[PDB]
Structure formats: structure tokens, C-alpha cells
């Protein structure tokens, strides 16, 4: 229950702790304001990128320091600014409060709470512009970040310290894939060891408020809100917030990373940050480069993504993994911002809308997605079982494109075409259904080892879902053997084949037929 | 300083005269008996003062009156490439009204203003001679801002044409305005605005070029009976570079106007003169501008031409085509011949209805 003692004790603590330092400080005045930027006179002592504050309870970033005046960009409700207002120094370089107290909170880019739930019990502050760890401090990515999407974990494994670009079109499931990845971590978070206990940050830039709320609900319903913090810059706020929202997201992350925690960052979506920086630059009257973007958008997205790494054991074995999302204008992957971010990240999972409308979900374009870290982060069972699948599917796609109008063909083409159709049918799965890796390996074994070669294409997704629940109810030693050793030993593989055959010998086909 | 904002004289004495944008007589026939003076920039008729369009503006062009009807009060855009017949369509429209003007009834007598912006002087003389040959100079006023005149006159010319027109409209006359053409209007206003160091936007136009065309065109309207039931019909012309319609001025005027007669040089060369692209030109007023005898005939015409344009590829293989559509192809080919028309020969409504009857009722087959 509640008690009066806690409320009285909190007020008495505030009262007793109240004092004023009476500190001497420079006050400036606003001499110009417009459209989310303002010029300040005075402030002889202001640092570059000092966080200013304005009388409306509004902050600003001192970007340009001229001989007579300081050009400050305004963060939040610039409507409340007018000429002749006094401005004062916060005394801090551009920084956010940070700490474990952010887990389970929704905050705006400044590290103010937006959920209305309460104040934030911050541990310390971190400057946004602290340099990424140098070439000597890093280590090789060597550790799996299990996403729970069969399409991804089979062909394009994500390792801790990778940056994996989720480039796609509008309305293709990019947000659904990232929420699925954040949900999948709950099976790890319930263990106490920091080594497995991945914790997550989702930063929303320019999303609809309903879409942010829907993500907050889907993560509450999954239990992910124990360990997720949401930086929200919804489409209604000023360009300065949409510009900071990735940086503050990374700064909340880095405080845990350098402590030797594992962190996941989702940027949703990093094109709308580029558009916000285009706004702020053109209002500053800097000249545009290509596609109206200012010359330095590369130095925006690289300065951001280079923070994500795995540290060396000498610096504490922590790591941060980035999933930047990019939206592609009608699938032109040669556009400016797509190619800039593809040049930074360690690989991409291109999601193609032409497949999504056919019901291939997730719509992973297996022919263009890659992981440039590759099998170094993939558990040896998955590496052995799935490592062929990628090229076999790509050559299935070109073969299907050829054979679509071939009246008859060789038996080797027809067998490959049927295998590839069954493997594409195998890889799809429904939304919010994260599969543990001990099940993903078996689901892909069914395909690659040809145990599906009896089954008609319309039965295959049913068959795979049922068989995983069969092996979950009885013969659990398959999944225990796989998980406890990360390898599919022969003495388990024979028991698996025996369960496969025993299931096929009892399988009623959806067409009313039966097979073996 | 004179003590007044830009004004032009107005009156009936402008009929059959040629004037520069300030209402000074340019033909040298003598001084103009100016009846009254109007400011160039009075308020357009507001949404309470108007009435629905419900009276035909007989163009005398089969390919217009049967498919993209113009009602007195509409703003119809004659958008085309150069040398595709835009000037000829508008001259036909003005010539056609003589059959009405010879009747004494003010409810029928359409008066006409032709506003020439940036034409060469001999082209305005050619147009004047074309209207004299037809007798239209009894009831039409030409506002001449020829290309020799400074950018200021090109910029004012559409406004003064509208200001002369509004005096007749508010007295309960019917007026037709032709602007030939608003592309050189926009180019003059861009010249003026850039010399004044105003900020340039897309295609170097100043920010307000949509507002410049809009506050011109939205002064065309049909007034309600409380204001004398007069009306003004605008035929803005514009010229499109290489048949694009995604250039700035085309896009603005297409968004402002009520209906758009696309004229295409390809159809012009293939023999379809006037070159109305009946497959893409539309009118938002629709049947409300046509007489009942025209509705009773033209109703299926757009559908027949759409089916013909679909079938056109099968003309090479017409033996193998089913007879029930072979007839549609042969009808469509005859309707396309039926819609051709020689310049300066506008047909009265009672003759074009019979022309469309021949085709649509199959007697021509």
C-alpha cells in the first residue's frame, strides 16, 4: 500500500537540499529569431555547442559564434521565442542525462520524459560528440545477435557490433522486423549474466504518434519494456529534435556499452533525420550539394554509426549493434542517402515491396541482401546447415525468371525449381513470432537436407510449424543438444531424422493425399 | 505621383478598336470615347455572388462542343505546343458569335476581348484581318501588348483585358476573354520580378506566380440574377515546351482552370485538324453546358472514340477481328473523319448536331 512517510520524506529532502549557489554568469539577449533558429548577442564565455536555455523553458545549441553574435538552433517549441528575451548558459556542452533509470521509459531527444510517467532518476550526463573508439580499442565481431527471423538468421546473420541496414520501401515490414528483433531478446534478458543480457534502444524519427504508441504497446505485451528505452521524435515536433534523436539514442546506449553491457539500437528511420538536417542547413543558408542535401550528410550518418562497435577486452567487452532503417523512393537503391548509408554499414537486408504484396513476409530480397561480417557471428550448427541456402535461392530466382515461359525443361532444372519453391515457402513466418535459434536450425535442416521433397508446396509452412511443436513436446534432447553445444552432432541428427520419418509416416497432406 | 492606383478607361466605345494595356488607341482610327474608369485590381465576385454554369458558349467546333463543352462562365485552357492551332481555335470561337450578335437580344449577344501578349505586330494585324473578314470587329476588342513593348505592358495586358471585360459583365452582358498567351505573361512578370531583386523560386519564377494567374482567372465567373446575370468566359492559352505538362506554368494553370483542351502536334500532322486530343482533354462542367439536342446525340460519342482508340492496333488484322467489333472500328474511323474541320468555318449548333447525328446514328457507315 501507500504511506504518508515517503511523500513527506521526499518533500523534506527537497526542502533541506534546496540552496542557491548565487553564481555569477553571463546573460545574453535574442537579437533575431525565425523558423527554429535564433541569434544571441552577449555571452562572451559561451562554449561552442553549449546547450543554451531560453525564458520559455526552451533549449538551444550554439552552433556558430560570430564576432558580435551567436547563432543558436532551437530545440523544441521555437514558437515561444521572441526578440529581447534573455538567454542563459546551462554550463554544459551538448549532452543528455544517462543511466539504467532509462530502461522502460519514453523520452524526447533532450532526455526529458514524454510518457508522463514521472521524472528520470539519471546517473550522470554524457556529451553527444565524444569520438568513437579507435582502431586499437575495437575487436572483431564474433558473437551472435539472434533476431528470430528465419530469413535473416539463415542468410544474413547479425553479430554484436555489426551495423545492419534494413533498407526498404514504404510499408514493407521494416518496423515489424525491428520490433521482432527487440522482442526476441526476452528469452536472454531473463538470465542474470551481463554477457547474454542484451538491452535495447529504439529511436523513432518522424514516425506518426500512433505508430510509436503501437510499438510501445507491442513491446509491453511481449514484456520487452523491462529493457527497452524509446527516444521519440514524432513527425509533429521541430526539425532540431528530429536531427538529435539518433545522437541521443546512441548516447543513452554508449553509457551502457563502455560499462561492458551489450546494447541494441534501432534507428527508425534515418532518412527522416537526413531530411531534418537538410532543413536545419538550408535555414542556416549553407549551400546545397547533391539532391539538395548539404555537403556533410555523410559526416552526419558516419559520425552516428561509427559509435557502434565491439570493444576489446582491455576496455570491457561491451558492444553496440545498430539497425538503421532507410526508406527508398520506389526501390531506387542507387539514390543518394541509400548509397551513403550502404557505404557505412557492414551489410543490408533489402526488403522488396513487389514480394511483400505476394505474401512473402518478411520480404527479404535474398539476391541483394548481404552480411559483410558473414559466418563469423553465426553459431556453428546454423553455419553448417544454412550456409549453402543463399546462393541456391539466388540461382532459384534467376532460374524461375528463365523457366516462367519454358514449355518443357531438363530434370535437373525441374528438381532445382521445386526445391527452391519449397525453400522460399519454408522461409516466411507470421508477425511477432520470434523463433529461438535452437528451432531455427531445425526448420532450415528440413529444407536443406531435402526432407521436404515429399511435401507439396501448399503444405510446407504447416508441416514446419507442426514438426517444431512435435519436437518441443517429445524428443526435446534435439533442442537441448543444439543449444548446449551450438553444434548439431551426428548422434542427435539420427534421432532428428527418425522423428522426421516418424512424422512423415503420419502426415495427412492438405490436398487430402499422403506421402513418404 | 498621380493620386490613384492603376486604372483603365472602359465603355462600349472599345468595340472594334485596338488598344494598348492603358486603354490608349493603338490603331490610329481616333480617340476613344471612354465611358467610365476602373481600377485594374478590384475584388473578384465572391462565392455568394456567383451562380451555377447552365448556358452554352457555342464554340462552333465539333471536337469541342460535342466532347468538352464550354458554358458561359467556365475557364477553359487551350494548352498545346507551338503551331498546333491554338490561335485558330480561339479565332473560330470569336467568329462563331456573329450568328448571335445580329439578333438584338442581350441574353444572347456575346461580346469578345482578345488579349495579345508578346505577339509580333504583323500577327496581331493578321488576326485583326481574320476577324474583319468574318465581321467580328463589330463586337470584339483587341488589347495589343506586342513583343516590342516593355515588360510592364506585357504584365498588365491580361489584367486590362479583364478590367474592360468586367464593366460589360457587371452590366448584365455576356463576355468572352481570350488570353493569347499566359506563358509570355508569366515570362514578363518573371523579368520584372528578377530585376527588382525579389527572391526566385522554381524555374526562376518569383513565389507568387500561381497567385498572379489565379487572381486573373478567378475574375471570370457567372454572376447571379441579383447582379444582373452577366457572365465572363475565359479561354487562357498556354504554350508547352516539347509537349510536357509538368512545367511550372502549365501545372498552375491546369490546377486553376475548369477544363483543358490538349492540342497535340502529332494528331495535327496525322490529319486531325483541329488537333484536340479527345482521349485526354476533359471539362468539369460537362453536360450542364450542352443543349438537350446535343446530349441526345453526343452521349455515346466519347465511348465510341475510346473503344476505337483501344481497337486501333487491330486495324492491320481486321479480317481476324470479330464482326461485332469490326463495326466499332469502322464507326470510330468515320467519327474521327467527322470531327475534322477547316479553319475559319465554325458551324452553328443546329448544323453540328446534325453532323454528329450522321455519325452516331450510323447513317454515315
Amino acid at each position: 500500500t501507500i504511506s504518508a512517510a515517503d511523500i513527506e520524506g521526499a518533500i523534506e529532502d527537497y526542502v533541506s537540499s534546496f540552496s542557491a549557489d548565487t553564481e555569477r554568469e553571463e546573460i545574453g539577449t535574442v537579437i533575431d529569431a525565425g523558423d527554429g533558429i535564433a541569434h544571441v548577442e552577449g555571452l562572451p564565455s559561451v562554449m561552442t555547442q553549449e546547450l543554451l536555455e531560453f525564458p520559455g523553458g526552451v533549449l538551444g545549441v550554439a552552433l556558430n559564434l560570430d564576432e558580435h553574435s551567436v547563432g543558436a538552433v532551437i530545440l523544441g517549441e521555437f514558437e515561444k521565442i521572441e526578440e529581447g528575451q534573455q538567454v542563459k548558459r546551462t554550463g554544459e556542452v551538448l549532452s543528455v542525462p544517462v543511466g539504467d533509470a532509462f530502461l522502460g521509459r519514453v523520452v524526447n531527444p533532450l532526455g526529458q520524459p514524454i510518457d508522463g510517467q514521472g521524472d528520470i532518476a539519471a546517473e550522470t550526463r554524457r556529451a553527444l560528440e565524444l569520438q568513437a573508439p579507435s582502431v586499437v580499442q575495437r575487436q572483431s565481431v564474433s558473437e551472435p545477435l539472434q533476431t528470430g527471423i528465419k530469413a535473416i538468421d539463415a542468410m544474413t546473420p547479425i553479430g554484436r557490433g555489426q551495423r545492419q541496414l534494413i533498407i526498404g520501401d514504404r510499408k514493407t515490414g521494416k518496423t515489424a522486423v525491428c520490433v521482432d528483433t527487440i522482442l526476441n531478446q526476452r528469452e536472454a534478458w531473463l538470465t542474470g549474466d551481463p554477457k547474454q543480457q542484451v538491452r535495447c534502444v529504439y529511436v523513432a524519427i518522424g514516425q506518426k504518434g500512433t505508430t510509436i504508441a503501437s510499438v510501445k504497446r507491442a513491446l509491453e505485451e511481449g514484456g520487452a519494456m523491462e529493457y527497452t528505452t524509446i527516444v521519440a521524435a514524432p513527425a509533429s515536433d521541430a526539425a532540431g529534435f528530429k536531427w538529435l534523436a539518433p545522437y541521443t539514442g546512441s548516447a543513452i546506449g554508449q553509457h551502457w556499452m563502455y560499462n561492458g553491457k551489450h546494447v541494441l539500437i534501432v534507428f527508425d528511420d534515418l532518412s527522416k533525420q537526413a531530411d531534418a538536417y537538410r532543413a536545419i542547413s538550408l535555414l542556416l543558408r549553407r549551400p546545397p550539394g547533391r539532391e539538395a542535401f548539404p555537403g556533410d550528410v555523410f559526416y552526419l550518418h558516419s559520425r552516428l554509426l561509427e559509435r557502434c562497435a565491439k570493444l576489446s577486452d582491455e576496455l570491457g567487452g561491451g558492444s553496440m549493434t545498430g539497425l538503421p532503417i532507410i526508406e527508398t523512393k520506389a526501390n531506387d537503391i542507387s539514390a543518394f542517402i541509400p548509397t551513403n548509408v550502404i557505404s557505412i554499414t557492414d551489410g543490408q537486408c533489402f526488403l522488396e515491396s513487389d514480394l511483400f504484396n505476394q505474401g512473402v513476409r518478411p520480404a527479404i530480397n535474398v539476391g541483394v541482401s548481404v552480411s559483410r561480417v558473414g559466418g563469423a557471428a553465426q553459431i556453428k550448427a546454423m553455419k553448417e546447415v544454412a550456409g549453402s541456402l543463399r546462393l541456391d535461392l539466388s540461382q532459384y530466382r534467376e532460374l524461375e525468371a528463365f523457366a516462367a515461359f519454358a514449355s518443357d525443361l531438363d530434370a535437373a532444372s525441374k528438381a532445382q525449381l521445386d526445391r527452391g519453391a519449397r525453400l522460399v515457402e519454408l522461409l516466411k513466418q507470421p508477425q511477432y513470432s520470434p523463433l529461438a535459434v535452437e528451432e531455427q536450425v531445425v526448420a532450415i535442416f528440413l529444407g536443406t537436407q531435402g526432407h521436404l521433397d515429399s511435401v507439396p508446396v501448399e503444405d510446407v509452412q504447416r508441416f514446419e510449424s507442426e514438426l517444431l511443436e512435435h519436437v518441443k513436446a517429445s524428443h526435446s534432447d534435439i533442442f537441448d543438444g543444439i543449444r548446449e553445444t551450438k553444434k548439431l552432432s551426428e548422434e542427435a541428427e539420427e534421432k532428428l531424422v527418425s522423428v522426421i520419418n516418424e512424422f512423415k509416416k503420419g502426415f495427412q497432406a492438405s490436398d487430402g493425399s499422403s506421402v513418404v | 505621383r498621380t493620386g490613384e492606383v492603376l486604372s483603365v478607361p472602359v465603355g462600349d466605345a472599345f468595340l472594334g478598336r485596338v488598344v494598348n494595356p492603358l486603354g490608349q488607341p493603338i490603331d490610329g482610327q481616333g480617340d476613344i470615347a471612354a465611358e467610365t474608369r476602373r481600377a485594374l485590381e478590384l475584388q473578384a465576385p465572391s462565392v455568394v455572388q456567383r451562380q451555377s454554369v447552365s448556358e452554352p458558349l457555342q464554340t462552333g467546333i465539333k471536337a469541342i462542343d460535342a466532347m468538352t463543352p464550354i458554358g458561359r462562365g467556365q475557364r477553359q485552357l487551350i494548352i498545346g505546343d507551338r503551331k498546333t492551332g491554338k490561335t485558330a481555335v480561339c479565332v473560330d470561337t470569336i467568329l462563331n458569335q456573329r450568328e448571335a450578335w445580329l439578333t438584338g437580344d442581350p441574353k444572347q449577344q456575346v461580346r469578345c476581348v482578345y488579349v495579345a501578349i508578346g505577339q509580333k505586330g504583323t500577327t496581331i494585324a493578321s488576326v485583326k484581318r481574320a476577324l474583319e473578314e468574318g465581321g467580328a470587329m463589330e463586337y470584339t476588342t483587341i488589347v495589343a501588348a506586342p513583343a516590342s513593348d516593355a515588360a510592364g505592358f506585357k504584365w498588365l495586358a491580361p489584367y486590362t483585358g479583364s478590367a474592360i471585360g468586367q464593366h460589360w459583365m457587371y452590366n448584365g452582358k455576356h463576355v468572352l476573354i481570350v488570353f493569347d498567351d499566359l506563358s509570355k505573361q508569366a515570362d514578363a512578370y518573371r523579368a520584372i520580378s528578377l530585376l527588382l531583386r525579389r527572391p526566385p523560386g522554381r524555374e526562376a519564377f518569383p513565389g507568387d506566380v500561381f497567385y498572379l494567374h489565379s487572381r486573373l482567372l478567378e475574375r471570370c465567373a457567372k454572376l447571379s440574377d441579383e447582379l444582373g446575370g452577366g457572365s465572363m468566359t475565359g479561354l487562357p492559352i498556354i504554350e508547352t515546351k516539347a509537349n510536357d505538362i509538368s512545367a511550372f506554368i502549365p501545372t498552375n494553370v491546369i490546377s486553376i482552370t475548369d477544363g483543358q483542351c490538349f492540342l497535340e502536334s502529332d494528331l495535327f500532322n496525322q490529319g486531325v485538324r483541329p488537333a484536340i486530343n479527345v482521349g485526354v482533354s476533359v471539362s468539369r462542367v460537362g453536360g450542364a453546358a450542352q443543349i438537350k439536342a446535343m446530349k441526345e446525340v453526343a452521349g455515346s460519342l466519347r465511348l465510341d472514340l475510346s473503344q476505337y482508340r483501344e481497337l486501333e492496333a487491330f486495324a492491320a488484322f481486321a479480317s481476324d477481328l470479330d464482326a461485332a467489333s469490326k463495326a466499332q472500328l469502322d464507326r470510330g474511323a468515320r467519327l474521327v473523319e467527322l470531327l475534322k474541320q477547316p479553319q475559319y468555318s465554325p458551324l452553328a449548333v443546329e448544323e453540328q448536331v446534325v453532323a454528329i447525328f450522321l455519325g452516331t446514328q450510323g447513317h454515315l457507315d
Binding site: 500500500t1 501507500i2 504511506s3 504518508a4 511523500i7 513527506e8 518533500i11 523534506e12 526542502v15 533541506s16 534546496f18 540552496s19 | -
Partner: protein
């Protein structure tokens, strides 16, 4: 799940009435203490034992 969902709503509404009744007691007791605490805050602001 539907049975446990209903039981959660009964428990959440059960706490809603309990907590609101407890808070009305708590607010009464603190009105006495707040006159004492407020006098401390005035001495902190002023620097003297008002």
C-alpha cells in the same frame, strides 16, 4: 488467458478504489506536516530562523 485477463481487471479496479481511499487519508496527515516543512523552506530561502 481470458479468465486471467478478467481477474487482472478485477484486481486493477480493486486497487483503484483502495488506493484512492488511502490517498485521502494520506493527504490529510500531510496538511499538518506541510505547515512545518514550509517554515523550514522559508528559513532556507531567507537564511534566517523565521
Amino acid at each position: 488467458r481470458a479468465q486471467a485477463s478478467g481477474e487482472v481487471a478485477q484486481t486493477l479496479t480493486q486497487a483503484d478504489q483502495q488506493l484512492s481511499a488511502q490517498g485521502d487519508q494520506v493527504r490529510s496527515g500531510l496538511e499538518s506536516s506541510v505547515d512545518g516543512l514550509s517554515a523550514k523552506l522559508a528559513s532556507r530561502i531567507l537564511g534566517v530562523d523565521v
